Design an enzyme around this catalytic site. Structure first.
Site, PDB file in Angstrom:
ATOM      1  N   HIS A 213      64.266  18.794  39.434  1.00 18.18           N
ATOM      2  CA  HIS A 213      65.649  17.708  38.855  1.00 18.18           C
ATOM      3  C   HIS A 213      66.571  18.824  38.459  1.00 18.18           C
ATOM      4  O   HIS A 213      67.932  18.302  38.745  1.00 18.18           O
ATOM      5  CB  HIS A 213      65.007  17.090  37.559  1.00 18.18           C
ATOM      6  N   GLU A 256      61.972  13.583  41.763  1.00 18.03           N
ATOM      7  CA  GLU A 256      63.350  13.943  41.517  1.00 18.03           C
ATOM      8  C   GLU A 256      63.680  15.348  41.987  1.00 18.03           C
ATOM      9  O   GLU A 256      63.849  16.255  41.287  1.00 18.03           O
ATOM     10  CB  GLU A 256      63.656  13.757  40.160  1.00 18.03           C
ATOM     11  N   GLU A 332      59.725   3.511  38.704  1.00 17.73           N
ATOM     12  CA  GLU A 332      60.040   3.493  37.260  1.00 17.73           C
ATOM     13  C   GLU A 332      61.019   2.224  36.955  1.00 17.73           C
ATOM     14  O   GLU A 332      61.985   2.269  37.807  1.00 17.73           O
ATOM     15  CB  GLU A 332      60.611   4.658  36.869  1.00 17.73           C
ATOM     16  N   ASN A 392      67.824  21.088  24.000  1.00 18.65           N
ATOM     17  CA  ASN A 392      66.850  20.127  23.779  1.00 18.65           C
ATOM     18  C   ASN A 392      67.663  18.629  24.000  1.00 18.65           C
ATOM     19  O   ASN A 392      68.577  18.541  24.219  1.00 18.65           O
ATOM     20  CB  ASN A 392      66.048  20.045  22.491  1.00 18.65           C
ATOM     21  N   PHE A 396      64.707  11.609  23.093  1.00 19.69           N
ATOM     22  CA  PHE A 396      64.393  10.983  24.736  1.00 19.69           C
ATOM     23  C   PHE A 396      62.936  11.390  25.250  1.00 19.69           C
ATOM     24  O   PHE A 396      62.534  10.989  26.105  1.00 19.69           O
ATOM     25  CB  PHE A 396      65.429  11.432  25.741  1.00 19.69           C
ATOM     26  N   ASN A 399      59.359   7.439  25.083  1.00 24.63           N
ATOM     27  CA  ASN A 399      59.714   6.354  25.797  1.00 24.63           C
ATOM     28  C   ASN A 399      58.448   5.205  26.097  1.00 24.63           C
ATOM     29  O   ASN A 399      58.488   4.454  26.856  1.00 24.63           O
ATOM     30  CB  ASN A 399      60.243   6.499  27.170  1.00 24.63           C
TER      31      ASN A 399
HETATM   32 NA    NA Z   1      62.460  10.567  28.826  1.00 25.81          NA
END
Ligand code: NA
Ligand code: NA
Ligand code: NA
Ligand code: NA
Lengths: 412, 206
Positions: A213, A256, A332, A392, A396, A399
């Site tokens: 990614h 990704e 997703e 960082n 996030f 989830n």
């Molecule tokens: Na996340």
């Protein structure tokens, strides 16, 4: 980092079983099945060596076969002397599915002609057929509706060390909340996970450990032939390890990493070696030549998202773009960050209305929060940046539909 | 469009599936193609309207494709997506709501585009029935048309009211509809579905 999975010693005889593949074929109405067992040996070939494959349904033997080594003629040079293919006929087999996970036990014996056992291996066998026909993903001749979820291997205390009790708790909760499928989030899982999914009845998407990614333009490595050997190792070793598990219904090439020629090469390799499972990959627009299934990430139900090179069409529109015939399964969707999952009912109305919308995998199962302790020794849940860690992404990492200790959120 | 409509048969295809009626239908199709094939404004041939689906339709579709391959052929009959049409051409299919009739379902057009194995374009031969104070929801159709490449539009029903002029005892004209001439069983005001009045005065829906 560290040695985060088990370490063991295995002792084998010099003349040994080195590999075995199982495959099941069926007639039109699944009344007749043939179990295909190919066994490979290592060591010295002797004329007295034999291989026996027996199929056991609980306690009663339902089929068995014995043969000496030496396969069919392959090419101008002959065949494999160190391989044998066993064919077993099964009448009215019980079929494996997430609803009813019927399992047989297959035992492979390497022994002498006089009857002396040298070495035995075994695996659980599930009779099921996965294929894409006329744009629909079918299991045992019926179109699937995927009630899936993405799951990382995470424990708030032990980090990324997985144990049987946590896996069993996770599977029980998922089944109790009407999930029938799980996507191994961007890497192969602990070996016991597939056995548990076989036994309890969950469909599994097995993913190679490839994600780039952070590259610009994200396919810098996957379009480079110098990185093809490493990617190939990551794909081929996963397929070699996991190809016998009935719960694995779909292979995934990673996550990704853009779209590169290496992806096309590895897609074709998997289709050649294991044609019994479809292959999917989201990178580079989710509908490239390296995927059998349109698998977008966070595509919305009715609203288009026109990004320059990799647009995220609405899934309904995506199905009918000119020339498009593949099924659509979201890899997703419905990002479950905190107080979330608004609009979930719209996705499920769409799933039930459209035949070629065969469901999706929610992101994601469990929060990736870690436990820290205050000056009083009272534990508290920590997220990104709470360890002084180099740049960082704060909260996030959480989830999940459940807390790190597996307590449900309201969205569940 | 060829001059063929057997809406009143039970079932609708009783005549169009009968080989004894093939000569008459063939005349109605072939003579129209022979008369009109040189006109540039004609871009699509139509095999008729509301006659079910019969083998005669397949035969005439193939005949037109053989004689004049420069224009696509469409036909709404039984299903609107049969083998006798190059274009999915449903009648009054809704934008988002399915209408599951037993043998000839009217899927929503968005869903229709994506049914397994379906690759043809979709053009509604009739939509937005403009009866009186009507054309609610028109903007939804046009949002759908602009969003989806394979939704290439449609034909509104319809242009002009089919009202006739009668006169009272004072000689003042007034517009008449179905049962106003004493005619044998009639369908009252369903003859007026136009965007304009019979004298070509616009309705507000225009
Ligand atoms: Na996340
Ligand atoms: Na569906
Ligand atoms: Na369009
Ligand atoms: Na009318």
């Amino acid at each position: 980092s560290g040695i985060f999975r088990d370490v063991s010693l295995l002792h084998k005889p010099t003349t040994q079983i080195s590999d075995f593949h199982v495959a099941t074929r069926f007639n039109d109405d699944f009344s007749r099945a043939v179990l295909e067992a190919e066994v490979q040996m290592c060591g010295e070939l002797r004329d007295y060596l034999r291989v026996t494959v027996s199929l056991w349904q609980g306690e009663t033997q339902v089929a068995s076969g014995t043969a000496p080594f030496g396969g069919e003629i392959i090419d101008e040079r002959g065949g494999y002397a160190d391989r044998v293919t066993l064919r077993l006929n099964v009448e009215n087999p019980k079929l494996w599915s997430a609803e009813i996970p019927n399992l047989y036990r297959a035992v492979v014996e390497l022994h002498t002609a006089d009857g002396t056992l040298i070495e035995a291996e075994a695996c659980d066998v599930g009779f099921r057929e996965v294929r894409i026909e006329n744009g629909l993903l079918l299991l045992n001749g019926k179109p699937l509706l995927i009630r899936g979820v993405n799951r990382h291997e995470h424990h708030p205390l032990h980090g990324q060390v997985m144990d049987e009790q946590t896996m069993v708790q996770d599977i029980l909760l998922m089944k109790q909340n009407n999930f029938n499928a799980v996507r191994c989030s961007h890497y192969p899982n602990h070996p016991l996970w597939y056995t548990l999914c076989d036994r309890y009845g969950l469909y599994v998407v097995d993913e190679a450990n490839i994600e780039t990614h952070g590259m610009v333009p994200m396919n810098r490595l996957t379009d480079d032939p110098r990185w093809l050997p490493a990617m190939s190792e990551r794909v081929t070793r996963m397929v070699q390890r996991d190809r016998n598990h009935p719960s694995v219904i779909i292979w995934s090439l990673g996550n990704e990493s853009g779209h590169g020629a290496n992806h096309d090469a590895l897609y074709r390799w998997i289709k050649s070696v294991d044609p019994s499972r479809p292959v999917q990959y989201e990178g580079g627009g989710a509908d490239t030549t390296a995927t059998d299934i349109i698998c977008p990430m966070y595509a919305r139900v009715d609203e288009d998202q026109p990004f320059p090179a990799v647009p995220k069409w609405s899934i309904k529109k995506w199905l009918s773009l000119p020339g498009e015939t593949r099924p659509l399964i979201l890899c997703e969707y419905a990002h479950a960050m905190g107080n979330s999952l608004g609009g979930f009912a719209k996705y499920w109305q769409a799933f039930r209305q459209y035949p070629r919308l065969q469901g999706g995998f929610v992101w994601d199962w469990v929060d990736q929060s870690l436990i820290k302790y205050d000056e009083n020794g009272n534990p508290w849940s920590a997220y990104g940046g709470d360890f002084g860690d180099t740049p960082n992404d704060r909260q996030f990492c959480m989830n999940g539909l459940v807390f790190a200790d597996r307590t449900p959120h309201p969205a569940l």
